[PDB]
Amino acid sequence: EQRARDLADERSNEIIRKLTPEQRREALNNGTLLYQDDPYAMEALRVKTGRNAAYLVDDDVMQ
Amino acid sequence: ELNGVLQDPDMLRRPDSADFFEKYIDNGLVTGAIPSDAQATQLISQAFSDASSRAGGADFLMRVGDKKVTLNGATTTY
């Protein structure tokens, strides 16, 4: 479980980088997301979309 | 670039140089020529000290202190 754990990371990073939070919302409804098939890549994406929001809430209470 | 129409001690007391300064600061803040509102403030506070220590400056200042400028989101008068 080394490659699939490692390749999900790269593929998710490319998803986060190559798409604004609005091209992603609609690419998820037209099946044209860069890696829609890969369950590991999209699960890592859903994890990192949790950490970004975690910071955006924690910091906007800290301020 | 402000010393082009704000140094000639007869070109200050004209009533358009106030409009020139207002348009300079505004179009600098909007069209990126003046990026940061922490930098338009330094331009204000240096152009006013150039125009205050100079013959012809009192009326330029009294004319510009009624023009509108928008910094830090809050709009106000100089």
Partner: protein, 78 residues
Amino acid sequence: KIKEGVFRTREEMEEYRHSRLQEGAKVYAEQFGIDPEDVDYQRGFNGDITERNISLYGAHDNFLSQQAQKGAIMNSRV
């Protein structure tokens, strides 16, 4: 550009970040010869995008907070 004070909002920083990410991922590649779509290039270029984004968001929300303070003062005077 964040800590200098160009972006007044969060949406403008978001758009600026995204567009400059794309244009840099292209320009630096074509300067170094590497294919911009290369799989290994996009392994170290897009490496740790969430930590970079979090650092940027933090060092920009500091600016948003101080800008809100400044604007609230200059607005409670008008």
